[PDB]
Amino acid sequence: GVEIETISPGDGRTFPKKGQTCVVHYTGMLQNGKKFDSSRDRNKPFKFRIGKQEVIKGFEEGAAQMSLGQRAKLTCTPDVAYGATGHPGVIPPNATLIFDVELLNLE
Numbered sequence: 001g002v003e004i005e006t007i008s009p010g011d012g013r014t015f016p017k018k019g020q021t022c023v024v025h026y027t028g029m030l031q032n033g034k035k036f037d038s039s040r041d042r043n044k045p046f047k048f049r050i051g052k053q054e055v056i057k058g059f060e061e062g063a064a065q066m067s068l069g070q071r072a073k074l075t076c077t078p079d080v081a082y083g084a085t086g087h088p089g090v091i092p093p094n095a096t097l098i099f100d101v102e103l104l105n106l107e
């Protein structure tokens, strides 16, 4: 599943609600591998709708349990990421992914 290790605490009370749009900054990295993406490196926050299955389960489940302003390291096992299939040319099969995520705003 997804494990959370807080980097910076949030307000501890404002969590993503159904339908809301999460505004996040993230950096993705293969466990014991290379970084493959960074919204911070291109200075451009990433947005996605909660509960609309727009992003892998682990990323959404991680964000869903974070409060406004919180930043955390998410460790996602393959079953809540890209599984046995992986992501063509970027994420190999059975890859555990590490995501440094910061919940910047809720829209």
Ligand SMILES: CO[C@H]1C[C@@H]2CC[C@@H](C)[C@@](O)(O2)C(=O)C(=O)N2CCCC[C@H]2C(=O)O[C@H]([C@H](C)C[C@@H]2CC[C@@H](O)[C@H](OC)C2)CC(=O)[C@H](C)/C=C(\C)[C@@H](O)[C@@H](OC)C(=O)[C@H](C)C[C@H](C)/C=C/C=C/C=C/1C
Pocket: 026, 028, 036, 037, 046, 053, 054, 055, 056, 057, 059, 087, 090, 091
């Ligand atoms: C160049 O950058 C890519 C993102 C890259 C691709 C490669 C991966 C390593 C990665 O580097 O992101 C990455 O770090 C990553 O794994 N991410 C992105 C951050 C959130 C977590 C994860 C993810 O779920 O990606 C996503 C993963 C790859 C695919 C999804 C996984 C969950 C599953 O339920 C979905 O349906 C099967 C598909 C990519 C996204 O976050 C983008 C935003 C979303 C989608 C494509 C789908 O939700 C789609 O559904 C039709 C939509 O509703 C969108 C809005 C429609 C419009 C036209 C498409 C825009 C495409 C934008 C693509 C972007 C910015």
